[PDB]
Amino acid sequence: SKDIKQVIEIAKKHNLFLKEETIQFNESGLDFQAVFAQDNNGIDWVLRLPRREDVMPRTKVEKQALDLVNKYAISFQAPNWIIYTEELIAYKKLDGVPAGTIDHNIGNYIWEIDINNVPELFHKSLGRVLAELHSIPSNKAAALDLVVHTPEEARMSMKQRMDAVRAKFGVGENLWNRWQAWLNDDDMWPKKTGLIHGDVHAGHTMIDKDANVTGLIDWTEAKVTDVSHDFIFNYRAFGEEGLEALILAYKEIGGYYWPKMKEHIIELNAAYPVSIAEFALVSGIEEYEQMAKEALEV
């Protein structure tokens, strides 16, 4: 009840007037508490209540990415932080629903689509969305604090991140030689980079009733690098068929394509343990430590 009252008062201080009976809390994270509420005009909002100091420095990158997408992109919605202070971030909820959500059990997906009959519009729409995203001219930005890689630098980045993980955690033997083989295969690696979302998965892909992707949320991992990261979810969730469907739609609307694109994404997928290990470090959450160690094949 006091939580509810505080939400109302913080929102009110930012001229956001809420229906108290609609206020819903997600379980807080280390960084903020996510809150849902409807305003006095019937409009649904998403609030982030900060739980750490230095809100502006820690959100600079996400906000730069959001600014780029809101300026340039028409095929998808992204959060537009109409309220952006150290005390509150809030945006009008995007249309649609997440295609799936990570549950609070094993962590499997609770799906809004039929995993055994994925609508083909999901892949066609996501391919259009990603092709638009990855061609945004991040260079026209006067200021850019996103990580920015050339193709060569994206490869060196993966090499370094892998060495780093093999030295804090160690890395299984056979997994390493796969990784190193991938790194050393010139023809496999893309010759172009782009602005990526960096955390594309069903929980962040908003869909309409026909499973068109209409929006993307949670842009904290945005950067200019290998576009391949935004294809990984499709491969993991939908296998080779959903990966191929996404690549096809992307290529056919003009997205960057190279002959070994599928094979490269599959090798990047095998490097997924690098990202879990890194999250374990930054978050300090014991569950991700054990998750990282199993994924790294100690």
Ligand X SMILES: CC[C@H]1OC(=O)[C@H](C)[C@@H](O[C@H]2C[C@@](C)(OC)[C@@H](O)[C@H](C)O2)[C@H](C)[C@@H](O[C@@H]2O[C@H](C)C[C@H](N(C)C)[C@H]2O)[C@](C)(O)C[C@@H](C)CN(C)[C@H](C)[C@@H](O)[C@]1(C)O
Which ranges in the chain belong to alpha helices (H)? Answer: 2-13, 55-72, 120-134, 151-168, 173-183, 232-252, 261-270, 272-283, 286-296
Q: Which is nearer to ligand X, 84 or 279 (CB)?
A: 279
Q: Which is nearer to ligand GDP, 35 or 277 (CB)?
A: 35
**Is residue 93 at the binding interface for ligand GDP, with CB under 6 A as the rule?**
yes
**Is residue 217 at the binding interface for ligand GDP, with CB under 6 A as the rule?**
yes
Q: Which of 236, 263, 285, 294 binds ligand X (CB under 6 A)?
A: 236
Q: Is 31 labeled as ligand-binding?
A: yes
The two beta strands, 100-102 and 109-111, are: antiparallel
Q: Tokens 């780029």 correspond to what residue?
A: 68
**Is residue 218 at the binding interface for Ca ion, with CB under 5 A as the rule?**
yes
Q: Burial of 84 by CB count in 10 Å (0-12 exposed, 13-18 middle, 19+ buried)? A: middle
In whole angstroms, what is the distance from residue 182 CA to residue 263 CA? 10
Residue 66 binds which entry of Mg ion, Ca ion, ligand X, none, with Cβ cut-offs from 5 to 8 Å by kind? none
Q: Is 218 labeled as ligand-binding?
A: yes
For the record, the structure tokens of 91 come out as 């945006």
Contacts to ligand X from residues 101-130, by CB under 6 A: 102, 106-109
Q: Which is nearer to ligand GDP, 66 or 261 (CB)?
A: 66
Q: Is 243 labeled as ligand-binding?
A: no
Q: Is 256 labeled as ligand-binding?
A: no
Stated length of the chain: 298
Helix (H) or strand (E) holding 35: strand 32-38
Q: Which is nearer to ligand GDP, 285 or 298 (CB)?
A: 285
What distance separates the 2 farthest-apart alpha carbons in the chain? 59
Residue 236 binds which entry of Mg ion, ligand X, ligand GDP, none, with Cβ cut-offs from 5 to 8 Å by kind? ligand X
Contact status, residue 190 vs residue 151, Cβ threshold 8 Å: yes
**Is residue 220 at the binding interface for Ca ion, with CB under 5 A as the rule?**
yes
For the record, the structure tokens of 123 come out as 């892949």
- In 3D, which of 159, 192, 199 has the Cα closest to residue 65? 199
Contacts to Mg ion from residues 199-228, by CB under 5 A: 218
**Is residue 108 at the binding interface for Ca ion, with CB under 5 A as the rule?**
no
Q: Is 73 labeled as ligand-binding?
A: no
293 in helix, strand or coil?
helix
Q: Is 199 a catalytic residue?
A: yes
DSSP string spanning 226-257? -GGGGGHHHHHHHHHHHHHHHHHHHHHTT---
Please list the residues that pair with 102 across neighbouring strands: 109
Contacts to ligand X from residues 194-223, by CB under 6 A: 199-201, 221
Q: Which of 5, 29, 30, 115 binds ligand GDP (CB under 6 A)?
A: 29
Instruction: Please pick, among 187, 199, 226, 230, the residue that the annotation labels catalytic.
Output: 199
**Is residue 226 at the binding interface for ligand X, with CB under 6 A as the rule?**
no
Binding mask 168-207 for ligand GDP (x = CB under 6 A): -----------------------------------x----
Binding site for ligand X (CB under 6 A): 102, 106-109, 199-201, 221, 229, 232-233, 236-237, 272, 275-276, 279
Residues acting as catalytic residues: 199
